[PDB]
Amino acid sequence: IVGGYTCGANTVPYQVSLNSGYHFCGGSLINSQWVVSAAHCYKSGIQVRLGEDNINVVEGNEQFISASKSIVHPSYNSNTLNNDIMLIKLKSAASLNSRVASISLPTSCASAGTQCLISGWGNTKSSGTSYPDVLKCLKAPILSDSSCKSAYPGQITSNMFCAGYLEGGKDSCQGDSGGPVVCSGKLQGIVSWGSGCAQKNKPGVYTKVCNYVSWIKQTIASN
Ligand SMILES: [Ca+2]
């Protein structure tokens, strides 16, 4: 997250870190057994880390639970990032508590202009590299479809939305991928892509979770 703020330990209790020997992507806990992330975060061999604040210190509220199954969306296209969504099943259910909690799936799609909370352990610099140890947060508004398409001509599908600031300076970034965009208390987006981070006229692009609720529900009812 570039231009964000330190969230505060366990104030984003649905945020997970995906670890394959090191943090590589975020995700969102949607119930005691299942995480939503980005399909481009697929790796074999994922351990889900819940209850994290500093990802490099065991502070005492973590749960580390191996994945048993990962399910990339059936229509994922890694070239365009259309349908950039994945489900990860935990080998055992998390113990839900004040620091490890699920986020609701949406009923309706969020609106342009809504301010959402985006979070992660990704890079904090637009130019260069600095990865935080503690979770960072950013409030960013959803942009109109027309503004999103103007920023990335020929690249935005109906399964994507833009959020952020066309002036630059505030965005998600590498290492935030897969993590949550929460609007009105529900999971509306997944950190997916963007041209660089926090550059002028190049806002973040997010997977539009409301288009996937019936796939998520039928998949979790079956696996
Ligand atoms: Ca930790």
From Swiss-Prot:
Catalytic function, reaction form: Preferential cleavage: Arg-|-Xaa, Lys-|-Xaa
Activity regulation annotation text: Is inhibited by scorpion cyclotide trypsin inhibitor TopI1.
Entry note: cofactor: Binds 1 Ca(2+) ion per subunit.
Protein location: Secreted, Extracellular space
Matches recorded under InterPro entries: Peptidase_S1_PA, Peptidase_S1_PA_chymotrypsin, Peptidase_S1A, Serine_Proteases_S1, Trypsin_dom, TRYPSIN_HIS, TRYPSIN_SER
PTM characteristics: Subsequent cleavage after Lys-125 leads to alpha-trypsin. Further cleavage after Lys-170 yields pseudotrypsin. A cleavage may also occur after Arg-99. Not sulfated on tyrosine residue(s).
Keyword Transmembrane: no
Gene Ontology cellular component annotations, sorted alphabetically: extracellular space; serine protease inhibitor complex
Protein name (Swiss-Prot/TrEMBL): Serine protease 1
The organism of origin for this protein: Bos taurus (Bovine)
